[PDB]
Amino acid sequence: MMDKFRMIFQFLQSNQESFMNGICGIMALASAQMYSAFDFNCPCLPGYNAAYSAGILLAPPLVLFLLGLVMNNNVSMLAEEWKRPPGRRAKDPAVLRYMFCSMAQRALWAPVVWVAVTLLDGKCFLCAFCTAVPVSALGNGSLAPGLPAPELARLLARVPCPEIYDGDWLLAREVAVRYLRCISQALGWSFVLLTTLLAFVVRSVRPCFTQAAFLKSKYWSHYIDIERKLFDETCTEHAKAFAKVCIQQFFEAMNHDLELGH
Amino acid sequence: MMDKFRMIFQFLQSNQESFMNGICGIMALASAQMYSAFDFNCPCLPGYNAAYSAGILLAPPLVLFLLGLVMNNNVSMLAEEWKRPPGRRAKDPAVLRYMFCSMAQRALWAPVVWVAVTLLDGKCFLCAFCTAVPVSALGNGSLAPGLPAPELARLLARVPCPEIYDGDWLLAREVAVRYLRCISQALGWSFVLLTTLLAFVVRSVRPCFTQAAFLKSKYWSHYIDIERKLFDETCTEHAKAFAKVCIQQFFEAMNHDLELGH
Amino acid sequence: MMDKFRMIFQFLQSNQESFMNGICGIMALASAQMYSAFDFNCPCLPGYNAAYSAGILLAPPLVLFLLGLVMNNNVSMLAEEWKRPPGRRAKDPAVLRYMFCSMAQRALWAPVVWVAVTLLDGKCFLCAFCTAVPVSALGNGSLAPGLPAPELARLLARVPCPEIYDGDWLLAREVAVRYLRCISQALGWSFVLLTTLLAFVVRSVRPCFTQAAFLKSKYWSHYIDIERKLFDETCTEHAKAFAKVCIQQFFEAMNHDLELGH
Amino acid sequence: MMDKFRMIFQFLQSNQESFMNGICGIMALASAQMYSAFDFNCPCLPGYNAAYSAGILLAPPLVLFLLGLVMNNNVSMLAEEWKRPPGRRAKDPAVLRYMFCSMAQRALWAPVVWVAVTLLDGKCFLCAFCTAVPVSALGNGSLAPGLPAPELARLLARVPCPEIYDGDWLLAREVAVRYLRCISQALGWSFVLLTTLLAFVVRSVRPCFTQAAFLKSKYWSHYIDIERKLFDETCTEHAKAFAKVCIQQFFEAMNHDLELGH
Amino acid sequence: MMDKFRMIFQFLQSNQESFMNGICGIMALASAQMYSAFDFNCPCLPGYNAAYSAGILLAPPLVLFLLGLVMNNNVSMLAEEWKRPPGRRAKDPAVLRYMFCSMAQRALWAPVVWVAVTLLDGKCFLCAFCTAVPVSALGNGSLAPGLPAPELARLLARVPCPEIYDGDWLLAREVAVRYLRCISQALGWSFVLLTTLLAFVVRSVRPCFTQAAFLKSKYWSHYIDIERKLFDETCTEHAKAFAKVCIQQFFEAMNHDLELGH
Amino acid sequence: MMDKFRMIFQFLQSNQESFMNGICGIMALASAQMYSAFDFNCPCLPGYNAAYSAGILLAPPLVLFLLGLVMNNNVSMLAEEWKRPPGRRAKDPAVLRYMFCSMAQRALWAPVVWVAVTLLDGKCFLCAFCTAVPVSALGNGSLAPGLPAPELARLLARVPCPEIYDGDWLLAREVAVRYLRCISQALGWSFVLLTTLLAFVVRSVRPCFTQAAFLKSKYWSHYIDIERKLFDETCTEHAKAFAKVCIQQFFEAMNHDLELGH
């Protein structure tokens, strides 16, 4: 099971060449790996499955999203100037609208890798649709020998839980699995395809790439840096002149000498 | 079992990019790992469980909290100036109230990771509510064949202790477990979700972020640095002039020469 | 199974000598390895195979292609100046046609390694043509003992799925496999041969290598570098003169002194 | 068993950020690990246990304490000036009392980690109170079938020694253990809690933190450094002028030439 | 199986001392290792073998050859000036003939290591001549008990495929193998001997080592370096004077000020 | 089997202190290790052995010898000036005879380590003299019960091939082996002794150590270095003045401007 995460492990061990997305690589690479040690096991009960599996395609994604906004050091400047009234805003809506949108496209790198990499291994999908398999399809001389609706859902639904499987009635194990891990791995490619193709279009066309506001932004965020870095200079400077008055008082103020004079 | 902690192990091995929270990463990453080598095993007795399990969601958290306050080098300055009377305080309540509050939000990074990572593996929860499972639910032709209340609590309660399990009466093992590790992993996400969302709000709104007092603080804590660093200069300086009087006395004072003169 | 990817692992660990193709080595080396942890298992059903196997020779290639264009920092400049009308284009079609073509030949290094390295191991090919093997050829006293067409496709088609194989009727297992992994490894060489030989011709002849436009290009792309790098200078410069007016106001504006004066 | 010590192993491997306590980390981290390779096995005899177990909560702690005082380079200066008569002491009792007390709180970091980490694994506690377990409690249809007092102590007392356990009479093995490793791990938390909370109070209040004597101390210990470092200068200086008289005598004193002159 | 390639692995890990051949060591060392992970398994059918084995002594060699020419940065200069007409060639045939020949003797280091290291392990040779072994030689009381020609080729030919071997008729397994891995390892030495001895003669005698043309060559290839390296200087220089006119326009052109003036 | 080569592996990993022999350590250390992965297995047939074993004490040595001459960068200078006529030789026979002899004593470090390290493990010797063992010596109640000459050579000769050994007739296995690995390891020491002792004599006496010609040599080989290193200076110098005439033509020659002028 180490394969899905040990890969980025040496890849992390490989080099130190990246960007903000590589800074996102600090987190989401763990998201490529955090799946590995976090186990998965479904109740194999009659109706809980379709509830439970939807838990592991919506919450842990949404967590990794919101942990992207708070993680970067900008939201206050947008949060601060939004709550204030219009007019008083020292920034145009344009620089707001852009700079707000350039937070999403750096956050979305985690919650798409953690929807691929829990489809390609199918576990998330297996416990979610096993209740409705066409049992007549490849059923070893099938025909549903008088089987009812209840007490068959409790027959099908165990399929992922291996050692507690009921038996050969209208199914083997290795044909009900290994046919739901096929359909799953079809979505996993026909999903990641559509997303990356939609990564094309975005850059390639447009949405708030105006040469005007891009300039004002990068100027501004560059300006906050020099402000913080420079304020410390005046403090340490202005403080240095102030310590000399007091520290000297400790000297010449205990005994004006040492008793250890030989 | 190495997975839960070997992950941060290479992640620790990964790089050296962090902050005070990464300084908290020095500790709490161990808290992500300290769970790994510290075993867990419940008494599997009739009433001790619900006592014992609450031991491992309140004490070891609270320890990691208080080890956060004492660990950082500020509490004296707050502790010193609080015990003194008002008026004599060389600092406003504002700089107190802020600087005191900026100790919590750096300490709380340990005691939330050690409440998630002992819910997602369910062991802490399993030995805490096994005494009340609905045995009729998925009970293999159930009906409670005349079973009493006592001598059934001692029947259910063994469920986590594997090799000492009684038997198939109104239960298998792999259906009483693997249904309490489902409910547990639901809290683990619906908890970590709520917390991180509440990490949003805090930064995003406010609570003592006033531009006034933030300034006075960082100036002040910057000032203590130069004071300590500069005091050593005068000492080593003032001492250097003093050693010359005595060290010379050792010379010219033993024999004023060596007998080894050839 | 680590062999196919652990090789580039130490090879990655080997040194840091490469180029843009070695920059492509950042990705496609993973493509040499990403096959390793991504499992493969075919439905072993009557007609799905020839559908499913074609999934793993066209989609995951095409993904690695489009992830090559978006990955490099040029497509905007081509995308921007293409949507505009002719005439307004500040660049000749020649520099366009070349610079556009020099994106393909840096992208095609991934989608040819991931068509070799899923033929040489034959798994992709095995589940794709097992339905039509000449069963009379090496069939252990063959003759098709009255076997029909249906209920034989479901007999042949299981061949890759080992533990669920039907039996010795007109076949053993280790002669239906180990004869489709021969034919496969013949394409894998007679393919990679043809491609590399076609890598010869390209460089060796020509296609838009004109000394004129190559010059204008590398000049231009060199020019964008100095523009971005130099703009930051004026900002940090022009900003530095501006901070001094405000930062001084914080000083001399809180109390014009400290109450901690002893 | 490597877990309890392999953790600090990579943690030691982690970084090199610490202080005098981290210098104590040089030793006590081994004390976190020295437990690992030093085995434990109790006599499983009738009365020796309660003797023997008390051996491994008092001696190996007390050793790690005294190895803390001697390890640091100060005790002579306190030991030297204590044996002398009062009055002649070149230092006030205050600087003595403080500087003596600042040896304990750097030594106590070892003998509290080696009392936690041999309670949380319970082995030290198991062989110490097995002689008195309430056998009627969870005793598999108990009632003490005429069992005497002697020849039952020799029945209970074997409980930790696994392969030499007598048998099922009024006990199984996995219920007499796994109920004494519960009670133990309760002290281990309710102990480490109380200690760390008492680490709060100490810093937070007081005990010889007077601004007067703290100054004189750190000045003094700073002074011993420059004295030792500077004495070597005069020696190597004063010696250099002295060697020239003799070393020249070796030259011009063997033959005033070489016979190898060609 | 790691031995054949893990050797160069630490040898690669050993040091970084080599030349263009060591640059070829970048590739062919993989060719010493690429054999390791690329499996081998022959059809064990009547006539395909002698076809199939010849596949793995001619194609994968020839690939590693052509990947040597394209890999080095010279073929264009030869390819460019060859297609042109004679007379216009700015270079003598001598510098052509030499410089063209000094491409082969740097490429031939891969396709001789991959013909040795797939003879010394004999697998390539075993599946190629098993159809004609003298069965009477060491045949355990032989005599060919009426065996025909067909239905014996299908008897011999299975010999490499271990678990599907027919049986003891006129052969054991461990005497038909372990006599074709002897004859093979004889060629492997009597081949590598002849080649290295022919490496002697080449250097030691001659073939286009003329002092005249060697000079003109190394001068020329040295000249292309300074040309490329120096062209970038004029560009970045000539561009720097050009950016100042436009970048200033962005300034003073948005608002000529900031609205954030307090 | 890793022991014979894993030793030099960490020894190689040990340090980087050596000379030309250590440069030979680059190769022959592999020769100490190349034995490890190159298998050995003898035909166990009646007469081929004494042929085959002599293959692995003469060819692979002789290869490592000739790979020593060609490997070092001197043979041309000797090869060039030997083919020429006497008189024209710019070097005395003395400097020739010495410099030629100082190639052997740097090459002979490989072909003596690969004759020791395939005697001390005896495999090379076992398959070479098993055909003539005194079977009466330690033969478990021997006497040769009417055994003929043929059909006994095929009885003895299998001895190294373990699983195909015939049986107990006049021999066990573990007494025919483990008496030919004794005699072998006697030569291995009484050989390496004689060689190293002959390494004494050589240095210690003489053979072309004349102070005259040693001087002329090391001067000469020192001179070739400065010649090659210095020639590149004039080229890059003389070329730099030449590029400026042409590179400027590319500028001012495409359009004398850019159309992108805004």
The span from the CA of D256 to the CA of C37, in Å, is 80
Kindly provide the b/e burial profile for residues B154-163, where b requires at least 16 CB atoms within 10 angstroms of the residue's own CB: ebbbbbbbee
Query: Which one of E248, E258, E262 makes the best mutation probe of the A interface by having the most chain A beta carbons within 10 Å?
Result: E258
- Do B26 and D21 touch, CB atoms closer than 8 A? no
Instruction: Give every CB contact of residue B249 below 8 A, 6+ residues apart in sequence.
Output: A262
Task: Please tell me which residue of chain C has the smallest CA distance to F255.
Answer: C216
* Chain-chain contact of D238 with B251 (C-beta, under 8 angstroms): yes
Please report where in the chains the tokens 């292309």 appear, as a residue. Answer: E224
Task: Please tell me which residue of chain D has the smallest CA distance to B43.
Answer: D179
| Option in D90, D212, D215 nearest A259 (CB) | D90
Dihedral of the alpha carbons of B210, B213, B215, B218, in degrees to the nearest 10: -120
Name the residue among B123, B131, B121 with its Cα closest to residue B45. B131
Phi-psi region of B123 (alpha: psi -120 to 50; beta: other; left: phi over 0): alpha
The span from the CA of F244 to the CA of F251, in Å, is 11
Neighboring chain E residues of A96 at a CB cutoff of 8 Å: none
The span from the CA of B48 to the CA of B127, in Å, is 10
Name the residue among F163, A73, D61, B104 with its Cα closest to residue E177. F163
Chain E and chain A touch, per 3+ beta carbon pairs within 8 A:
yes
Name the residue among F159, F157, F135 with its Cα closest to residue F147. F135
* Chain-chain contact of E240 with C226 (C-beta, under 8 angstroms): yes
The span from the CA of F63 to the CA of F52, in Å, is 17
* Chain-chain contact of E163 with C179 (C-beta, under 8 angstroms): no
The span from the CA of C245 to the CA of C248, in Å, is 6
Please report where in the chains the tokens 């559908």 appear, as a residue. Answer: C51
Q: Tokens standing for C254?
A: 């809180």
Dihedral of the alpha carbons of E74, E77, E78, E79, in degrees to the nearest 10: 110
> Max CA-CA distance within chain D?
111
Residue B203: C-alpha distances to residues A71, A77, B19, B21, B210 (Å): 11, 11, 17, 15, 13
Residue C201: C-alpha distances to residues C196, C198, E27, E78, F57 (Å): 9, 5, 21, 13, 47
Give the gyration radius of chain E's Cα atoms. 30
Name the residue among A238, A122, A139, A136 with its Cα closest to residue A186. A122
Side-chain-facing half-sphere of E13: CA atoms under 13 Å: 15
CA dihedral sign, ordered E166, E170, E172, E178: negative
Neighboring chain B residues of A243 at a CB cutoff of 8 Å: 223, 226-227, 230
Phi/psi of residue E135, nearest 5 degrees: -70, -30
* Chain-chain contact of D215 with A260 (C-beta, under 8 angstroms): no
* Chain-chain contact of A189 with C60 (C-beta, under 8 angstroms): yes
Instruction: Give every CB contact of residue D153 below 8 A, 6+ residues apart in sequence.
Output: D46, D131
CA dihedral sign, ordered E159, E162, E165, E169: positive
Q: How far is CA F238 from the centre of its chain?
A: 45
- Do A125 and A175 touch, CB atoms closer than 8 A? no
Residues of D within an 8 Å Cβ radius of B: 3-4, 7, 10-11, 14-15, 17, 120-121, 138, 172, 174-175, 178-179, 181-182, 185-186, 189-190, 192-193, 196-197, 199-200, 203-205, 218-219, 222-223, 226-227, 230-231, 234, 238, 246
Please report where in the chains the tokens 């060796």 appear, as a residue. Answer: C204
DSSP assignment letter at E252: T
Neighbours of chain A (3+ CB pairs under 8 A): B, C, D, E
**Resolution at which this structure was determined, Å:** 3.9
The span from the CA of A244 to the CA of F42, in Å, is 90
The span from the CA of D113 to the CA of E166, in Å, is 68
Q: Tokens standing for D64?
A: 């790690």
The span from the CA of A112 to the CA of D142, in Å, is 60
Q: How far is CA C210 from the centre of its chain?
A: 29
- Do E174 and F161 touch, CB atoms closer than 8 A? yes
DSSP secondary structure of E121-140: T-HHHHHHHTTS--TTTT-S
The span from the CA of E6 to the CA of C154, in Å, is 44
Q: Tokens standing for C84?
A: 């505009």
SS (H, E, C) E53-67: HHHCCCHHHHHHHHH
Residue B21: C-alpha distances to residues A68, B29, B103, D26, F87 (Å): 16, 10, 11, 25, 83
Name the residue among C204, C199, C202, C205 with its Cα closest to residue E75. C204
| Option in D205, D234, D246 nearest B247 (CB) | D234
The span from the CA of C54 to the CA of C49, in Å, is 8
Q: How far is CA F178 from the centre of its chain?
A: 29
The span from the CA of C75 to the CA of C62, in Å, is 18
Name the residue among B192, B222, B182, B200 with its Cα closest to residue B99. B222
The span from the CA of C179 to the CA of E42, in Å, is 8
Instruction: Give every CB contact of residue C191 below 8 A, 6+ residues apart in sequence.
Output: C115, C116, C119
- Do C66 and A197 touch, CB atoms closer than 8 A? yes
Q: How far is C90 from chain F (nearest CA, A)?
A: 5
The span from the CA of B154 to the CA of B48, in Å, is 12
* Chain-chain contact of E254 with A90 (C-beta, under 8 angstroms): no
- In chain D, what is the straight-line distance between the N-terminal and C-terminal CA atoms, in Å? 74
DSSP-derived 3-state class of residue A255:
coil
The span from the CA of D12 to the CA of D29, in Å, is 8
* Chain-chain contact of E182 with F36 (C-beta, under 8 angstroms): no
